Design a protein around this motif. Structure first.
Motif, short mmCIF file in Angstrom:
data_model
loop_
_atom_site.label_atom_id
_atom_site.label_comp_id
_atom_site.label_asym_id
_atom_site.label_seq_id
_atom_site.Cartn_x
_atom_site.Cartn_y
_atom_site.Cartn_z
N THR A 51 0.76 -1.20 0.00
CA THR A 51 0.00 -0.11 0.03
C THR A 51 0.83 1.36 0.02
O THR A 51 2.01 1.41 0.61
N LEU A 52 0.33 2.38 -0.69
CA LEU A 52 1.04 3.35 -1.17
C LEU A 52 0.08 4.60 -0.59
O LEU A 52 -0.99 4.38 -0.38
N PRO A 63 -4.76 6.65 -0.25
CA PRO A 63 -4.22 5.23 -0.19
C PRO A 63 -4.78 4.17 -1.02
O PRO A 63 -5.97 4.19 -1.07
N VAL A 105 -1.17 -1.84 -4.58
CA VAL A 105 -0.63 -2.37 -5.84
C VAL A 105 0.47 -3.49 -5.71
O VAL A 105 0.78 -3.63 -4.85
N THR A 114 -9.07 -0.42 1.23
CA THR A 114 -8.17 -0.34 0.10
C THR A 114 -8.21 -1.22 -1.00
O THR A 114 -8.22 -2.43 -0.75
#
Lengths: 341, 340
Positions: A38-39, A70, A73, A231
């Protein structure tokens, strides 16, 4: 010529998946892995600040845009101490275009058996087998991994063959145009397997292909990614099970759609296209060879009576009426169902 | 002009993770490691002694607010006998900005091709390539480790390159301004790479970066930490180097350090990360808000206007070439610009 209500072929080229392995400094190979992570990015969308009208929404104030976004990927990269990466698959050129797979009309079947016989007599399988094999022998099937890399190498292992595995070192530097490939030690021999695997009634011609990518330190590798039906995953990779570990793979159909980027005959061509009926360019979302042009597959296929008296008559045909025959044959190598009504 | 229903670029700058090593005297390397260690703090939060309004809660007595508050963090530091710390990654400069990655309108495509070719003629890539390249050559991507250090040094290794590794010694006292960076011997030859990277349809220009941080005795180090969704209140990001977990600086965290350039927003003091309606996350606002008319989409729709300025004979004002750098730096950033 009216189309049948059953026409179908089988494809002549049978690729497979591409497997990624990590080669260390010593002779040890390991399946490459990945991880979801997660970014937290910005909030740029232009539908989060503008409505359909165009003047800005007032719910999205200047404080709101800097909030943070958030997402998640899948993330694949070359490990730290690694030396390079191996990439391997297999092709098979298999003469399935000689006669239809299913055709409830005998007159249409005798038409499409005479075309493929008149094609190789008068035009020949030299142009298609050269164009198909260039995309194996340079990393077209490595899609974006070819980009941003130091040097990539291809090594071939053709099956009905004597010895001495055919290699292509430093492809970007030494293999650029067609005449670079013809200056290979054995280019005449591997083209002549594919000309015989389309000529014989049992032509087989299995290639075993293998790559070697030298990327930067700790760099990124990009595999094919699945069709997804607090997310949400924004990138999900395609994958296969090697040993006990999940590893990224290149789609079997992602690989066969790199070999068949050949179609640069379309009416105002610059960049070659993936061969299909009314051939699409997915970069800029249009169809060249539209039915209004009259140079798609079915508008050529209904001229199949006219194309026979061209090829049988002794006046050698113009470049317009061979680039319609190249496109017609290269759709019979692609497969598909060709019905109407 | 109008934004199409599909427009997307790819990016031109691809960084990697930064990996932390520990250099021992006698020059042997070991990946830096860490350990979650618990602690016990005071009970300061202001939501423990005051209510939603602001009068004090009567349950939080003097005794019950001096009670001790145990938690958990990850804690990384330099080992005792070490010398310094390495940090290593790589950047690639590509020419993805020349044409759209995907675009379903061919009037917009052939407008956004010409701006790139009018920008490299009338302005050229010299101002943008100098700004991206400094944030490597002083340790901007070393975020907080730069702070409270003795000194640090950068060593580049460019890839389409002959020899003689580019080196920057004592960045804190040696390189402070632009003309300090323009006094290195090979600095013209590295800006000419990123120019030739952006100017062709295959420009490649890989760099290899490696820092050397001399810390105090036994000091903390600060890597990038995960977006988590007793409990761990600080969880570092990590990889595996020799079968041992080791902290890493986020690939996306590094890429947002080479791209802190934007000091063209109308009250410019400090530079921001390059974004559509560029945000400042310290003091949480957006500069370049769409009410200003100076975000990316109220400049990209004036793309046709800029063709009738850049094609003339005259050198235009800073009001209309700062907003050409900002149009370019968002095409290098990549992303999707479609509407409806």
């Amino acid at each position: 010529m009216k189309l049948p209500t059953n026409l179908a072929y089988e494809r002549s080229i049978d690729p497979s998946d591409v497997c990624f392995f990590v080669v260390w400094p010593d002779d040890r190979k390991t399946p490459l892995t990945y991880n979801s992570r997660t970014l937290l990015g910005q909030m740029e969308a232009a539908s989060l600040a503008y409505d359909v009208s165009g003047q800005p929404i007032k719910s999205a104030t200047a404080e709101a845009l800097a909030q943070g976004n958030p997402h998640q990927v899948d993330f694949c990269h070359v490990p730290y101490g690694a030396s390079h990466i191996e990439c391997s698959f297999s092709v098979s050129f298999s003469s399935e275009l000689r006669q239809p797979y299913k055709c409830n009309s005998s007159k249409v079947k005798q038409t499409l058996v005479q075309l493929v016989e008149l094609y190789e007599t008068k035009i020949g399988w030299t142009e298609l087998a050269t164009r198909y094999l260039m995309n194996i022998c340079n990393g077209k099937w490595l899609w974006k991994n070819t980009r941003k890399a130091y040097c990539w190498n291809i090594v071939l292992t053709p099956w009905p063959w004597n010895g001495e595995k055919v290699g292509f070192e430093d492809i970007r530097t030494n293999y650029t145009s067609r005449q670079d490939f013809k200056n290979n030690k054995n280019w005449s021999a591997i083209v002549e397997m594919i000309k015989t695997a389309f000529s014989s009634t049992d032509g087989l011609a299995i290639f075993e292909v293998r790559a070697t990518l030298h990327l930067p330190t700790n760099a990124m590798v990009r595999p094919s990614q699945v069709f997804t039906e607090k997310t949400q995953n924004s990138r999900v990779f395609q994958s296969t099970t090697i040993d006990g570990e999940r590893s990224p793979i290149l789609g079997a159909f992602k690989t066969g759609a790199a070999i068949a980027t050949i179609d640069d005959w379309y009416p105002e061509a610059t960049e070659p296209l993936r061969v299909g009926r009314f051939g699409v360019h997915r970069e800029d979302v249009t169809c060249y060879r539209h039915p209004s042009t009259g140079k798609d597959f079915f508008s050529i296929l209904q001229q199949a009576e006219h194309y026979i008296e061209v090829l049988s008559a002794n006046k050698t045909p113009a470049q317009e009426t061979i680039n319609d025959m190249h496109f017609l044959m290269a759709n019979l190598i692609k497969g598909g169902m060709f019905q109407h009504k």
